[PDB]
Design a protein around this ligand. Structure first.
Ligand SMILES: O=C(O)c1ccnc(Cl)c1
Lengths: 141, 136
């Protein structure tokens, strides 16, 4: 239960979180979805999970008709406050389309912490340190 | 535990190479310490031997030059706790106005899984047990 663990460590989990959360590939969608659950408070997770509920669930709607890859451009930390700012670029590619869509740049404001939580054998292989996000907001530049 | 995930194993290794193969007079001792914390004494002493004694690398190069690392690719062999990484180094002599020409290398590694200081750098007890670098 330490808010910070090391700039290089904190930087890693956060980048992994965005890529899990903002990228779309039907392969490893479940592990992404699963990971975010472990890497989020219920309040933050509920806001993310909503896109997968009902017959309209993003996985059941798009499937493999399109994809979205993520590229981390920069990472800014506020270590003592458990706050970080990230800029990344998403590029979508629809197989229906001949070429990838124009890029989209974004800014992610995050609150984060690590927590002392008793865990099973499965929850660790994705999140060994109990890293979980407590705030999340995406905006353009 | 025994199993920790691929992208994480990829992380510790690349940053370890950067810790071990990069040269920057600042943070040497911590990096030197960190690599020490991140390594078994037997394989680390091979890394320490070149930094200990009157012949110490830090006392030869000092702050006259630097060497940075750039990761190109990473491949894992999980069940054996073995991994291979490929990187490119660019050296810079402070006296020279520009940077030296690049050189690429391959690192072969073996790996496996506290007070206040040992946790914050490694929380997992991740330790390196073997290390060998070769050219392409
Ligand atoms: O299409 C997206 O960018 C996207 C949106 C919401 N969740 C995921 Cl995993 C991917």
């Amino acid at each position: 239960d330490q808010t910070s663990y090391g700039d290089e460590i904190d930087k890693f989990w956060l980048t992994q979180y965005v890529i899990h959360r903002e990228s779309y590939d039907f392969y490893s969608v479940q592990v992404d979805y699963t990971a975010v659950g472990l890497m989020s408070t219920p309040n933050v997770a509920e806001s993310y999970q909503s896109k997968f509920k009902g017959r309209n669930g993003l996985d059941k709607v798009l499937g493999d008709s399109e994809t979205t890859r993520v590229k981390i451009n920069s990472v800014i930390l506020d270590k003592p406050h458990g706050v970080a700012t990230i800029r990344f670029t998403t590029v979508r590619r629809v197989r229906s389309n001949p070429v990838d869509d124009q890029p989209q740049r974004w800014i992610a404001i995050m609150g984060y912490e690590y927590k002392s939580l008793a865990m099973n054998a499965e929850q660790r292989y994705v999140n060994p340190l109990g890293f979980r996000v407590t705030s999340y907001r995406v905006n353009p530049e």
